[PDB]
Amino acid sequence: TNPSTEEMGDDFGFGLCPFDTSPVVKGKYNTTLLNGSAFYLVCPIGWTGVIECTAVSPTTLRTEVVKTFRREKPFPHRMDCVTTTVENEDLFYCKLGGNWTCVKGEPVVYTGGQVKQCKWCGFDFNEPDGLPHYPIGKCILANETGYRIVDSTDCNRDGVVISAKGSHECLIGNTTVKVHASDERLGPMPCRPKEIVSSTSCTFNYAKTLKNKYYEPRDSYFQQYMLKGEYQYWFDLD
Amino acid sequence: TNPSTEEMGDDFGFGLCPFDTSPVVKGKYNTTLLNGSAFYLVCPIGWTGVIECTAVSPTTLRTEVVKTFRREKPFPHRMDCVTTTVENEDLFYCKLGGNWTCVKGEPVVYTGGQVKQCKWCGFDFNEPDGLPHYPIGKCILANETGYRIVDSTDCNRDGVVISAKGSHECLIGNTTVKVHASDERLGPMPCRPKEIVSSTSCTFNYAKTLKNKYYEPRDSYFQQYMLKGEYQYWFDLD
């Protein structure tokens, strides 16, 4: 008295205000567990702030300070915190702090492991089948509950775009996925077809497609995607 | 006498030995009508040399030239001197000489008129709908007996050459021209095919082509000449 200064080292975290003073908060962000007398703060990584175990006269009008806990340098990572909160379902990496304090920043890029879910342009699958390269779009692991970005492929495969509204469905891997066209030239749909509806000598089987687009595989007796204009057929003779 | 010298006129014809003497001809071509003690010269178009009334006396053997008739510059054309013969079935421009005296040579040449037969690669031809330009190769009229000569586009029209031994029956005009292959790259069949064969549930026709050559026309449906490698096909898809 009056004032003081306790050079707050890195491993600061908990102490006791002196005479049951009424402390306050004024710094950079909000990450307090203030009691009313002593205190206890939660994962103050990168937190520049201070508090004065104050005093105030009710009757008269003045307010002083008996102990200042000052700070000017960052706090590196410390005890058991989490560097990754959530947002809707994206795993933005915790920028300025820890749990429930997590200020947002960048998304978490991909390093390695073994995946268990993947989502893209408005659809989600589970295994390599049908996709040009696995991983893609964005994915996650079995342990967690939010996605990790990695790639940013264009919802497009030469004229064919994977939106989420209109028109003809088709199955990549194992899941129904919508698709929306663009041009009108030759173009291989990357999505295996929906329903094979049919109807020895001259036998034919056929599906449903868009304009001038072919879907794998080619017919046997012709070796040329028997396109047509709206239906890619599949012939078979005796 | 002795040894005259009758420079026969440019309009010479009938012959007249004197006091009985079997003639002897020593000319360029072979165009002398020998009729006893009197010759007759029919069409000597550009012919020189000499011809002499030689006599034979059985006592001594002093052959005596009494009447020698001579021509000093080539003879012109006059009356019934046909200068247009043939060989088997091939006309040739009779260089020098007329009736039964066609020392043939260079070929005839076209210039117009009114035709009704043309010939090319092992098969005779009639109507214009087909070969790239009517007429072509060699042709004749209705009055003559043999063909002329005007053009010579080789019997090779895009990959395929046309010859005489099989192996596929394809038609042009109203004829029936044989044809054989030669390479693999995509080429257009220049002869409408012969027999159509079929095989509603899935109606379709098929004939025979070769490797990658297409018999016109394309089905409006798949709007591209289909093929297998050994056949070309035709649907009716209502």
UniProtKB/TrEMBL annotation, chains A, B:
According to its UniProt entry, the function of this protein is described as: Regulates viral RNA replication by interacting with the 3'-untranslated region of viral RNA in a dose-dependent manner. At small concentrations promotes viral synthesis by interacting with the polymerase NS5B while at large concentrations, inhibits replication. Leader cysteine autoprotease that cleaves itself from the nascent polyprotein during translation of the viral mRNA. Once released, plays a role in the inhibition of host innate immune response by interacting with host IRF3 and inducing its proteasomal degradation.
Disulfide bond annotation, renumbered to this chain? 17-53, 43-81, 94-102, 118-139, 121-155, 170-191
Which species is listed as the source?
Classical swine fever virus
**Compartment(s):** Host cell surface; Host cytoplasm; Host membrane; Virion membrane
Question: Which section of the whole protein is represented?
Answer: 776 to 1019 of 3898
Q: What is this protein called?
A: Genome polyprotein
Query: What superkingdom heads the lineage?
Result: Viruses
Task: Describe its assembly.
Answer: Interacts (via N-terminus) with host SP1; this interaction induces proteasomal degradation of SP1 with subsequent down-regulation of HDAC1 and ISG15 expression thereby counteracting the host innate immunity. Interacts (via C-terminus) with host IRF3. Interacts with host OS9.
Q: Which family does it belong to?
A: Belongs to the pestivirus polyprotein family.
